Amino acid sequence: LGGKSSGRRQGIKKMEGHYVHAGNIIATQRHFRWHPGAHVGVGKNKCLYALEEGIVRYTKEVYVPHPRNTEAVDLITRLPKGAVLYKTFVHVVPAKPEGTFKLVAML
Amino acid sequence: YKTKPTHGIGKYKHLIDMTLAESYAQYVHNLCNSLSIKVEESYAMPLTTHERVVQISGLSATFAEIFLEIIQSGVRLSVXXXXXXXXXXXXXXXX
Amino acid sequence: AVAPEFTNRNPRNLELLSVARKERGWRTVFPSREFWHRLRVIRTQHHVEALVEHQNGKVVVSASTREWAIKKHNVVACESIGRVLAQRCLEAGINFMVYQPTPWEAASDSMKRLQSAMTEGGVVLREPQRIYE
Amino acid sequence: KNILVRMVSEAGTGFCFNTKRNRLREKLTLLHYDPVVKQRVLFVEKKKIRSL
Amino acid sequence: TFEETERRALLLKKWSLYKQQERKMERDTIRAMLEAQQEALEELQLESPKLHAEAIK
Amino acid sequence: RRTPPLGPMPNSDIDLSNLERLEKYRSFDRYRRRAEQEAQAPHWWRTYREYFGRTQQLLERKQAIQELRANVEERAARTASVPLDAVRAEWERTCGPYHKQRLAEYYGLYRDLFHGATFVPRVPLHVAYAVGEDDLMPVYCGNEVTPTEAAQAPEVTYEAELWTLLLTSLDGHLLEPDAEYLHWLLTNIPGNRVAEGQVTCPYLPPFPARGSGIHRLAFLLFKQDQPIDFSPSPCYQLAQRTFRTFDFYKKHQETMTPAGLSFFQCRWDDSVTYIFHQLLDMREPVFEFVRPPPYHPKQKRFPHRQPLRYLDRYRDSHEPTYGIY
RNA sequence: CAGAGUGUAGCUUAAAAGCACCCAACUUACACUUAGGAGAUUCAAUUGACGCUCUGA
RNA sequence: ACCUCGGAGCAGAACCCAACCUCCGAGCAGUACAUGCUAAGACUUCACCAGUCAAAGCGAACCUCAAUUGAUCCA
Ligand SMILES: [Mg+2]
Ligand SMILES: [Mg+2]
């Protein structure tokens, strides 16, 4: 016997060049098929979401793990002396500027 | 992405008396490190007597000879069997 | 006569107002990139650099024993450098920093000394929040 | 193994919350937030409420 | 005591200074040997190959 | 479909035949450094930056160092705070100029004031605004000082043996941008003293509008080979003082090169109002800071699984409306 | 003792740098980290004259 | 023999995809006791129900874990 689990419907919900508002989920995954980049967050599922209004872009950026997170550090240590890991990152490149000074009155 | 020219950019898996004796062992280890040889392991084996080990693998005859000479140049040695003298030490090889 | 939108285009304007956007993410990668300015200390053999950086990567302010004015007259050296930087910061008007060291670095005495020096100078190593709404 | 228990605040009375604890061990006392009082306050265990 | 500590630090420094020189000397010696070996192999190659091969074994 | 890489892939050269011979970064610091270096480098795959971004002297120095060491003998180290003023002075003398460029770049003076093109402020300019008796509030390059403290014109020194001292606000207040407001204009100066040199435009204080942000004034100093004419009375009319330094630099400053800079931050204060009223003769403009409104999607007919808050997001506004009864 | 290549501390499309290296402490030891340590343009006005490497006698 | 839930293959590269197809497992633990209030904006196991993520704000500091669960009325 065994289990028949339903499809999980995970993956990218927003592709490069899409206009993504603050809060929109960008990509859902188990493990990191993509990582959070500029203005992109991570939920408890590892799901990536936009932190600002703007455009999604994908990039392959050098990956440095946090010192406190042990396993990654170990892996890094293991690598040979000219090696760099690299990983894919999702950014939102913000469109509308946060601020505009308007004239209230002439006092 | 697979079909993109940046395919395997993330790929990483493919890249990955007693006191005196102790001191001597340490020195030997250091020397090994310097000369670029695999130091596998070291032991703390049991008047009194005390033994120390420095397990080594892979070294060419000339280089090996040089290493031996340096080691020679106290206590004792034991690895052809190459013993010498000035607790105990035993640098077991695997050339 | 006055326009509706006066556009003050001072680069550091929205930083001092505490309104400009910090880069929020990079929650896997280190160090976090959410800061207006970052105190990057770079130690080597011989000389110890200290910097003040933006999101852009532009080094605004610095202090090092390579710069030869402070090579005249090590933990002490580091402290001195920090002090110098603090003075520099004051002149520039960078009174706020983020300092995100490795744990070992944080533990270290030299770093602590540097921090102390900075504090003395009058430069906080925390930096205020973005202020939304 | 684990019991469900109700915990009653001394200050800010009426507010009760449900928590876990091992069946073998001590009656539970805990600092926790009362939104009535709007301060942290000691709760004390009182009556187990199902076991599991 | 303070004086003793001061003395001790100095002594340590001296020791450190000594050790590095010795290390350097050792390295130099090693290098010399290596050079000799390099020379020797070449010479062997030039002269008679069988002998060289034997030496290598 | 397998496309080949456009340029060379990373991690190609270092894998090699064997892995057990290499050095590996046993530390993290080294790895971090490497990563940083990589980041600094360009690459072909977009990437972050695409989307977002004497001998004698030396000998002397060495000797001095040696002397210092001897003096120490070290013991002190085994806790000496060092004189800071001296260090500062040294910096000013030597690499201060070098430093200044970076700050200027950061602050966008070269891009706005000079339309591009960087230059080193070689000659050290030392301005200070008098506040009572002492201390004189010094205008270090980058500093925040209030327009109350900047109500009267400052004292200036530089220790240089002719000059033209200028002072301009870079933002372009009130009227349309790509404009600047000069605050004074000192000309044909002999040596260190302001009183000896001529003045075309006299000193106004800074006058930054309320809640307009922070403004960046800039003192400029140039080298005079030849004495030159310039161009308007003790005036407080605003349409005269609107002038951009780029054009000026171009169509005139040809026997001239800028050698001294200092920039200075400004905010609202109680003197600003006075300035607006007394001499400028107009109502002061109030500047808030308005953010763009909250988004919300389109109004859906049957919201479905949203809360009862759905309807509060689309409403003008709050009070209870009574249609027709 | 005649020629050629030259000649920044171990080493560099460094320009007094960064990598290497040494001592102590943590380490069985190594490793990491933290404190410290030491080092250089061979010398006189691009030219000449001292030091190596190499080839002759 | 099985009947609910989850992970891997079939299903090699956005999701989705069966069989009394092939293989692993779950029906819990552990740490907390601000596992406090609320709230823009999204995802969703192809319906609905159930699930999920979550900026800001107000309160405070200075969650781990794959599955680890069950409607209504009634008590
Ligand atoms: Mg659905
Ligand atoms: Mg929050």
Side-chain angles (χ1 to χ4, degrees), chain F residues 29-53 64 70 76-77 79-293:
Chain F
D29 203 324
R30 286 168 171 70
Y31 188 89
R32 177 96 175 285
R33 282 171 177 170
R34 191 68 232 288
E36 288 161 351
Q37 284 203 2
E38 273 295 284
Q40 273 181 31
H43 318 308
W44 48 258
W45 59 71
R46 64 229 78 163
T47 231
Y48 213 158
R49 213 96 46 71
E50 281 252 359
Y51 296 125
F52 274 117
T79 64
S81 195
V82 135
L84 300 178
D85 296 353
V87 170
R88 201 221 115 76
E90 284 183 29
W91 166 82
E92 265 291 331
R93 187 141 129 179
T94 335
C95 55
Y98 236 29
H99 266 214
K100 277 189 181 192
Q101 261 193 154
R102 298 158 149 212
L103 283 177
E105 284 180 335
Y106 177 95
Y107 276 95
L109 293 120
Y110 301 139
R111 83 166 188 262
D112 209 30
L113 204 62
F114 293 99
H115 212 85
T118 62
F119 79 94
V120 187
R122 302 290 205 182
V123 175
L125 216 183
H126 289 271
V127 189
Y129 278 82
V131 181
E133 295 89 330
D134 236 60
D135 200 336
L136 301 172
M137 213 298 180
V139 186
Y140 293 145
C141 45
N143 190 21
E144 314 121 53
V145 207
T146 58
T148 52
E149 290 164 291
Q152 190 113 217
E155 300 181 46
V156 180
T157 55
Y158 36 62
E159 195 78 351
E161 304 188 336
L162 287 68
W163 320 99
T164 54
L165 196 154
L166 190 150
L167 213 183
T168 39
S169 85
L170 280 82
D171 316 358
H173 296 60
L174 310 170
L175 259 290
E176 288 193 329
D178 59 272
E180 299 192 50
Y181 281 0
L182 94 164
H183 283 54
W184 71 357
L185 213 169
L186 311 178
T187 53
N188 315 301
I189 302 157
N192 298 315
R193 296 155 209 166
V194 173
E196 295 179 337
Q198 297 183 346
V199 191
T200 61
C201 282
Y203 185 75
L204 308 178
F207 57 117
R210 198 160 97 279
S212 69
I214 279 155
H215 311 250
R216 43 185 231 298
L217 307 191
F219 290 85
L220 320 180
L221 208 297
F222 313 77
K223 314 175 196 173
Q224 271 177 337
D225 264 340
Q226 186 215 124
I228 325 175
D229 77 308
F230 290 106
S231 194
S233 85
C235 176
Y236 307 127
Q237 198 100 183
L238 205 64
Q240 287 167 34
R241 290 165 155 290
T242 187
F243 103 73
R244 308 137 203 195
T245 57
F246 171 55
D247 58 63
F248 157 136
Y249 193 76
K250 194 170 182 180
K251 306 162 189 175
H252 174 142
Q253 303 269 339
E254 259 277 13
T255 65
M256 295 297 302
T257 49
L261 291 179
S262 69
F263 31 73
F264 152 68
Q265 273 143 227
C266 301
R267 287 186 208 170
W268 176 263
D269 227 302
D270 295 359
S271 58
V272 178
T273 49
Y274 275 56
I275 291 152
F276 276 120
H277 301 333
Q278 293 183 294
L279 38 150
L280 279 85
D281 301 308
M282 54 173 183
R283 292 123 62 200
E284 71 107 332
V286 188
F287 276 162
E288 182 170 18
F289 185 84
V290 178
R291 308 164 154 295

Side-chain angles (χ1 to χ4, degrees), chain A residues 9 56-57 60 64 96 100:
Chain A
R9 326 276 144 153
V56 175
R57 296 294 182 188
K60 308 226 168 184
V64 276
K96 297 187 195 168
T100 47

Side-chain angles (χ1 to χ4, degrees), chain C residues 69-110:
Chain C
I70 186 54
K71 196 164 66 173
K72 315 321 187 204
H73 317 282
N74 196 210
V75 164
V76 170
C78 287
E79 195 286 325
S80 78
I81 290 155
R83 261 190 146 200
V84 170
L85 211 182
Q87 188 260 320
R88 255 84 90 78
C89 282
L90 302 203
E91 59 127 325
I94 303 160
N95 352 344
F96 286 122
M97 303 291 202
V98 162
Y99 188 45
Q100 359 97 312
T102 59
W104 50 93
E105 285 278 19
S108 84
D109 296 43
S110 55

Side-chain angles (χ1 to χ4, degrees), chain F residues 11-39:
Chain F
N11 276 347
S12 58
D13 63 319
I14 95 297
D15 182 42
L16 228 77
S17 56
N18 289 22
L19 304 174
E20 298 178 305
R21 316 310 179 200
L22 306 179
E23 290 76 6
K24 304 172 179 180
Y25 339 95
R26 288 96 54 226
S27 66
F28 186 51
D29 203 324
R30 286 168 171 70
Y31 188 89
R32 177 96 175 285
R33 282 171 177 170
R34 191 68 232 288
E36 288 161 351
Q37 284 203 2
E38 273 295 284

Side-chain angles (χ1 to χ4, degrees), chain F residues 1-2 294-297 304-305 307 309 313-314:
Chain F
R1 263 190 39 268
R2 212 61 40 182
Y295 172 51
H296 316 297
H304 201 340
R305 220 187 184 190
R309 309 199 284 286
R313 303 208 259 267
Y314 314 87

Side-chain angles (χ1 to χ4, degrees), chain B residues 3-95:
Chain B
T3 69
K4 290 278 138 282
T6 51
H7 183 354
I9 223 162
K11 213 174 186 174
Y12 57 69
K13 179 177 64 174
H14 69 105
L15 299 176
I16 299 165
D17 310 345
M18 65 185 287
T19 51
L20 280 165
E22 288 181 343
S23 188
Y24 189 76
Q26 265 192 200
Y27 179 103
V28 168
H29 206 308
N30 275 336
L31 199 23
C32 220
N33 284 357
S34 190
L35 299 164
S36 311
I37 323 174
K38 292 173 168 168
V39 180
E40 298 194 342
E41 290 193 70
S42 59
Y43 298 119
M45 297 188 73
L47 301 175
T48 54
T49 179
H50 282 86
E51 256 280 23
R52 291 296 313 284
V53 179
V54 177
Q55 270 192 79
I56 292 166
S57 298
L59 58 171
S60 59
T62 57
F63 171 43
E65 272 272 4
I66 260 204
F67 176 42
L68 213 173
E69 104 90 77
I70 200 162
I71 282 182
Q72 188 185 124
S73 59
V75 192
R76 295 194 182 183
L77 297 168
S78 54
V79 183

